[PDB]
Design a protein around this nucleic acid. Structure first.
Ligand SMILES: Nc1ncnc2c1ncn2[C@@H]1O[C@H](COP(=O)(O)OP(=O)(O)O)[C@@H](O)[C@H]1O
Ligand SMILES: [Mg+2]
Length: 430
RNA sequence: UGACAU
């Protein structure tokens, strides 16, 4: 049964703009990161939000958001997108990739307006934004409303675990910007509720994830859909912190004469995260987690685990200890997942146990410690995980449990990530 | 394994 109607998004102005992490002590160190731009005829980067040829109201929304100065990815992607070019954007976690695409797209939607089309119940969005998880899609949706606040733009969302008709009937009214998880998006496409015949911008957030074996078929069904306008007559944008060369190659099928902007080393960890490791047997992990939480009372802690099974187990373990713990993973009801995330953000619960479902994109204020109870199999997922802390120039801590019986294969990539980020390398990862 | 329509 899927009947959950999520609460309606706040139309409280202050609350819409307060959905942000305030910049931290090292925000100005973003100026010291080497920017590599490759591709034909890159337009010059902009120097400030004031000198970015943005519309008065769009600029005023950026300033309402709290932002005073663009990050490196924004300095580059903004003029690139407004020139009409395709873009692969790589930049570390917590450095403002979302606004890098929202702000200019919102600008061009307003500056170069087209009348909406919704014909025969079938909406034709001018922007499709896809992301690999439901809570990230909702987050992106709320950021789009922030930067498009007070304008005539209509943003809609589409993701699973919600009542299909609630989202469907809303989309049917028409929307400029549709933000979606792929499953629910294709559902509406195959029902003739959404069509790609008016698309001006496609955006893959976490694009390296979207292009891997798990999502590539769903990406093809969008990019190559019969209703989709061809690559030469629309813009495609792809952002991530991580981007293996083999995945970069696959991206080029959907890109037209594109610019590749990489801020710092591709796939590098944020240097604002202190990365610590504890060597432990599979048995010892439980005791070591308890110990780490005991040594950190009053801190907001995000605990990553491999299985949904272990997520449920760890939440139970910590809860029976009398610690207020939320859990988020794919076997939980959608309502519960959104409530766990909200309880964790609000501070009601200081501990959140998560599978990889929360590894990418989520922007949670004041995560003090990210704990990898289980390390992931991919270094790129590790980079994203620890990036849940240390954002926008604030400093954070990651503590990862290393078990050689499980994680030996990761050691060479960990060590490289550590050295790139100026982190000490324990003897057991050498 | 883990995300991703019902
Ligand atoms: N130019 C800026 N100045 C201050 N804060 C910003 C700026 N750009 C983005 N932010 C904030 O930084 C946080 C991280 O943004 P996000 O787009 O999630 O980063 P990324 O996608 O690179 O991980 C968000 O809370 C966002 O509101
Ligand atoms: Mg992001």
């Amino acid at each position: 049964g899927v009947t959950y109607v999520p609460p309606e998004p706040t139309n409280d102005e202050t609350e819409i703009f307060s959905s942000t992490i305030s910049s931290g002590i090292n925000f100005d160190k973003f100026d010291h990161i080497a920017v590599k731009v490759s591709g034909e005829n890159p337009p010059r980067p902009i120097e400030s939000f004031e000198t970015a040829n943005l519309r008065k109201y769009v600029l005023d929304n950026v300033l309402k958001a709290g932002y005073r100065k663009p990050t490196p990815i924004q300095k580059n992607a903004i003029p690139i997108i407004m020139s009409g070019r395709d873009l692969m954007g790589c930049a570390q976690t917590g450095s403002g990739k979302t606004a890098a695409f929202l702000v200019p797209i919102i600008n061009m939607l307003l500056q170069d307006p087209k009348d909406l089309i919704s014909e025969n119940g079938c909406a034709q969005p001018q922007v499709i934004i896809v992301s690999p998880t439901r809570e990230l899609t909702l987050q992106i949706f709320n950021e789009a409303r922030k930067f498009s606040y007070g304008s005539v733009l209509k943003v809609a969302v589409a993701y699973g675990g919600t009542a299909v008709r609630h989202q469907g009937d809303n989309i049917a009214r028409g929307c400029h910007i549709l933000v979606a998880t792929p499953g629910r998006l294709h559902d509406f496409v195959e029902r003739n509720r959404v069509s790609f015949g008016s698309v001006r911008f496609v955006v893959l957030d976490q694009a390296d994830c979207m292009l891997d074996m798990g999502f590539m078929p769903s990406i093809e069904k969008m990019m190559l859909h019969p209703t989709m306008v061809e690559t030469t007559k629309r813009q495609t944008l792809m952002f991530s912190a991580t981007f293996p060369e083999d995945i970069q190659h696959l991206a080029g099928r959907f890109l037209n004469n594109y610019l590749f902007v990489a801020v710092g080393i591709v796939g590098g960890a944020s240097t604002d995260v202190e990365q610590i490791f504890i060597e432990v047997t599979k048995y010892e992990k439980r005791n070591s987690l308890k110990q780490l939480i005991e040594e950190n009372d009053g801190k907001r802690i995000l605990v990553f685990v491999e299985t949904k099974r272990n997520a449920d187990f760890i939440a139970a373990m910590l809860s029976e200890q009398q610690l207020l713990t939320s859990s988020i993973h794919g076997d939980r009801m959608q309502r519960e997942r959104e409530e766990a995330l909200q309880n964790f953000k609000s501070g009601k619960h200081c501990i959140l146990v998560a599978t990889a479902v929360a590894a990418r994109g989520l922007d949670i204020k004041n995560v003090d410690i990210v704990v990898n109870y289980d390390l992931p199999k991919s270094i790129d997922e590790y980079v994203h995980r620890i990036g849940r802390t240390g954002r926008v120039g604030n400093r954070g801590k990651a503590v990862s449990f290393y078990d050689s019986d499980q994680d030996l294969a990761l050691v060479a990539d960990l060590s490289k990530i550590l050295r790139q980020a100026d982190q000490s390398v324990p003897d057991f990862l050498k």
